[PDB]
Design an enzyme around this catalytic site. Structure first.
Site, PDB file in Angstrom:
ATOM      1  N   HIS A   1      12.148  -5.553   4.671  1.00 27.99           N
ATOM      2  CA  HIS A   1      11.446  -4.324   4.362  1.00 27.99           C
ATOM      3  C   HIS A   1       9.793  -4.622   4.746  1.00 27.99           C
ATOM      4  CE1 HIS A   1      10.134  -5.500  -0.092  1.00 27.99           C
ATOM      5  NE2 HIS A   1       9.070  -4.782   0.475  1.00 27.99           N
TER       6      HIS A   1
ATOM      7  N   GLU B   1      -4.446 -19.830   4.503  1.00 28.84           N
ATOM      8  CA  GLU B   1      -5.572 -19.060   3.509  1.00 28.84           C
ATOM      9  C   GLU B   1      -5.655 -19.207   2.312  1.00 28.84           C
ATOM     10  OE1 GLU B   1      -6.933 -15.707   6.345  1.00 28.84           O
ATOM     11  OE2 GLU B   1      -7.376 -16.808   4.723  1.00 28.84           O
TER      12      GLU B   1
ATOM     13  N   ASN C   1      -8.950 -17.259   0.592  1.00 29.40           N
ATOM     14  CA  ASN C   1      -9.670 -15.768   0.404  1.00 29.40           C
ATOM     15  C   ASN C   1      -9.356 -15.330   1.586  1.00 29.40           C
ATOM     16  OD1 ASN C   1     -11.532 -13.758   0.834  1.00 29.40           O
ATOM     17  ND2 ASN C   1     -13.067 -14.421  -0.594  1.00 29.40           N
TER      18      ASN C   1
ATOM     19  N   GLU D   1      -7.756 -21.923   8.290  1.00 28.03           N
ATOM     20  CA  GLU D   1      -6.912 -20.782   8.631  1.00 28.03           C
ATOM     21  C   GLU D   1      -6.518 -20.892  10.388  1.00 28.03           C
ATOM     22  OE1 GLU D   1     -10.187 -20.253   7.560  1.00 28.03           O
ATOM     23  OE2 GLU D   1     -10.114 -18.478   6.107  1.00 28.03           O
TER      24      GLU D   1
ATOM     25  N   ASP E   1      17.646  -8.117   2.361  1.00 31.92           N
ATOM     26  CA  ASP E   1      16.250  -8.318   2.558  1.00 31.92           C
ATOM     27  C   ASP E   1      15.364  -9.636   2.897  1.00 31.92           C
ATOM     28  OD1 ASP E   1      13.527  -7.003   2.501  1.00 31.92           O
ATOM     29  OD2 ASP E   1      13.489  -6.744   0.473  1.00 31.92           O
TER      30      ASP E   1
ATOM     31  N   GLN F   1       3.456  -4.934  -5.601  1.00 27.49           N
ATOM     32  CA  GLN F   1       3.241  -4.631  -4.069  1.00 27.49           C
ATOM     33  C   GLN F   1       2.055  -5.485  -3.644  1.00 27.49           C
ATOM     34  OE1 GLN F   1       1.526  -0.734  -3.961  1.00 27.49           O
ATOM     35  NE2 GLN F   1       2.780  -0.210  -2.192  1.00 27.49           N
ATOM     36  N   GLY F   2       2.238  -5.857  -2.354  1.00 29.33           N
ATOM     37  CA  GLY F   2       1.635  -6.809  -1.604  1.00 29.33           C
ATOM     38  C   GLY F   2       1.912  -8.130  -1.606  1.00 29.33           C
TER      39      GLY F   2
ATOM     40  N   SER G   1       5.684  -8.669  -1.625  1.00 29.41           N
ATOM     41  CA  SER G   1       6.650  -8.649  -0.757  1.00 29.41           C
ATOM     42  C   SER G   1       6.936  -9.672   0.429  1.00 29.41           C
ATOM     43  CB  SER G   1       7.050  -7.375  -0.351  1.00 29.41           C
ATOM     44  OG  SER G   1       7.198  -6.412  -1.320  1.00 29.41           O
ATOM     45  N   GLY G   2       7.992 -10.393   0.420  1.00 30.89           N
ATOM     46  CA  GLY G   2       8.127 -11.257   1.527  1.00 30.89           C
ATOM     47  C   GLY G   2       7.673 -12.844   1.108  1.00 30.89           C
TER      48      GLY G   2
HETATM   49  N1  LIG Z   1       7.778  -5.184  -9.283  1.00 28.05           N
HETATM   50  C1  LIG Z   1       8.021  -6.188  -8.330  1.00 28.05           C
HETATM   51  N2  LIG Z   1       8.563  -7.172  -8.451  1.00 28.05           N
HETATM   52  C2  LIG Z   1       7.769  -5.766  -7.006  1.00 28.05           C
HETATM   53  C3  LIG Z   1       8.053  -6.658  -6.065  1.00 28.05           C
HETATM   54  C4  LIG Z   1       7.845  -6.360  -4.729  1.00 28.05           C
HETATM   55  C5  LIG Z   1       7.322  -5.137  -4.407  1.00 28.05           C
HETATM   56  N3  LIG Z   1       7.072  -4.639  -3.292  1.00 28.05           N
HETATM   57  C6  LIG Z   1       6.844  -3.512  -3.448  1.00 28.05           C
HETATM   58  C7  LIG Z   1       6.335  -2.516  -2.400  1.00 28.05           C
HETATM   59  C8  LIG Z   1       5.880  -1.252  -2.657  1.00 28.05           C
HETATM   60  C9  LIG Z   1       5.772  -0.295  -1.537  1.00 28.05           C
HETATM   61  C10 LIG Z   1       5.475   0.888  -2.387  1.00 28.05           C
HETATM   62  C11 LIG Z   1       4.443   2.178  -1.173  1.00 28.05           C
HETATM   63  C12 LIG Z   1       3.035   2.850  -1.745  1.00 28.05           C
HETATM   64  O1  LIG Z   1       2.617   2.704  -2.929  1.00 28.05           O
HETATM   65  O2  LIG Z   1       2.446   3.167  -0.831  1.00 28.05           O
HETATM   66  C13 LIG Z   1       6.702   1.793  -2.792  1.00 28.05           C
HETATM   67  O3  LIG Z   1       6.927   2.035  -3.765  1.00 28.05           O
HETATM   68  O4  LIG Z   1       7.574   1.884  -1.922  1.00 28.05           O
HETATM   69  C14 LIG Z   1       5.695  -0.730  -0.348  1.00 28.05           C
HETATM   70  C15 LIG Z   1       5.975  -2.018   0.023  1.00 28.05           C
HETATM   71 BR1  LIG Z   1       6.295  -2.801   1.950  1.00 28.05          BR
HETATM   72  C16 LIG Z   1       6.314  -2.900  -1.099  1.00 28.05           C
HETATM   73  O5  LIG Z   1       6.648  -4.296  -0.684  1.00 28.05           O
HETATM   74  N4  LIG Z   1       6.833  -3.271  -4.782  1.00 28.05           N
HETATM   75  C17 LIG Z   1       7.184  -4.099  -5.197  1.00 28.05           C
HETATM   76  C18 LIG Z   1       7.272  -4.397  -6.439  1.00 28.05           C
HETATM   77 CA   LIG Z   2      -9.884 -16.656   4.541  1.00 31.76          CA
END
Ligand SMILES: NC(=[NH2+])c1ccc2[nH]c(-c3cc([C@@H](CC(=O)[O-])C(=O)[O-])cc(Br)c3[O-])nc2c1
Ligand SMILES: [Ca+2]
Ligand SMILES: [Cl-]
Length: 223
Positions: free
Chosen positions: A40, A52, A54, A62, A84, A174-175, A177-178
């Site tokens: 995703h 990396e 900072n 880097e 995924d 969020q941020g 992921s991966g």
């Molecule tokens: N609570 C967790 N353990 C968790 C882990 C990874 C996530 N990755 C994401 C994630 C969310 C979005 C937002 C989009 C937005 O707010 O603009 C969504 O709700 O779909 C987008 C991505 Br790409 C994510 O990996 N949420 C996540 C929550």
């Molecule tokens: Ca840096």
């Protein structure tokens, strides 16, 4: 990462940042030319950023390398996030050293209770958005399949596992992921999804990498 701590520069040498003019996902370096991340997180125009700490300051160490190709698992289902996982091949191999190193794939899956290290530059607020400049870390245990399915009934497949705290307060977000879930020096998970971040009884769900080792090996071998 919510409720985590500052890792310390280059203490997680396999952690990479996927960048398209800003950090959008994490990944893990598994050899000098390939990175594993989540399906995703796929998009075109990806620049992989290694060594990396900072992400807004070039501090040294880097290596910015463009992705030559991204291979999303053929059975990835964007609705259930089953399978995924994605592999990214780098345009040039990375120079590995103490600051940039790959992580080992597992030979066996991990048991509940195993303590793992999750890292990333994702949101640090469960209620609002606060993105950090440096890499955050969180130590979290793998939960039992029964607690996981109890928390997410009908949404957990055999290719997922839960890691975290049912009391809330500590989780990936969020941020993140991966990015990597490392337990005993092996990459056991990929940050995949969860309901909000660090909410009580809603742990994080991760892609179960041990189920994909042969796929990864076969795919890398043929590309
Ligand atoms: N609570 C967790 N353990 C968790 C882990 C990874 C996530 N990755 C994401 C994630 C969310 C979005 C937002 C989009 C937005 O707010 O603009 C969504 O709700 O779909 C987008 C991505 Br790409 C994510 O990996 N949420 C996540 C929550
Ligand atoms: Ca840096
Ligand atoms: Cl179920």
């Amino acid at each position: 990462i919510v409720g985590g701590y500052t890792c310390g520069a280059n203490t997680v040498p396999y952690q990479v940042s996927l960048n398209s003019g800003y950090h959008f996902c994490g990944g893990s370096l598994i050899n000098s030319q390939w990175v594993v991340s989540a399906a995703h997180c796929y998009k075109s125009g990806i620049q992989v950023r290694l060594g990396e700490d900072n992400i807004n300051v070039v501090e040294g160490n880097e290596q910015f390398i463009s992705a030559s190709k991204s291979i999303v698992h053929p059975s990835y289902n964007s609705n259930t996030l089953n399978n995924d996982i994605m592999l990214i091949k780098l345009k040039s191999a990375a120079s590995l050293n103490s600051r940039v190193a790959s992580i080992s794939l597992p030979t066996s899956c991990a048991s509940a209770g195993t303590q793992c290290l999750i890292s990333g530059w994702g949101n640090t607020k469960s209620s609002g958005t606060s993105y950090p400049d440096v890499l955050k870390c969180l130590k979290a245990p793998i939960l039992s399949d029964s607690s996981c399915k109890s928390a997410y009934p009908g949404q957990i497949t055999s290719n997922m596992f839960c890691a975290g705290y049912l009391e809330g307060g500590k989780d990936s977000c969020q941020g993140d992921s991966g990015g990597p879930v490392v337990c005993s020096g092996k990459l056991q998970g990929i940050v995949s999804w969860g309901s909000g971040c660090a909410q009580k009884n809603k742990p994080g769900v991760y892609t179960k990498v041990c189920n994909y080792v042969s796929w990864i090996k076969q795919t890398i071998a043929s590309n």
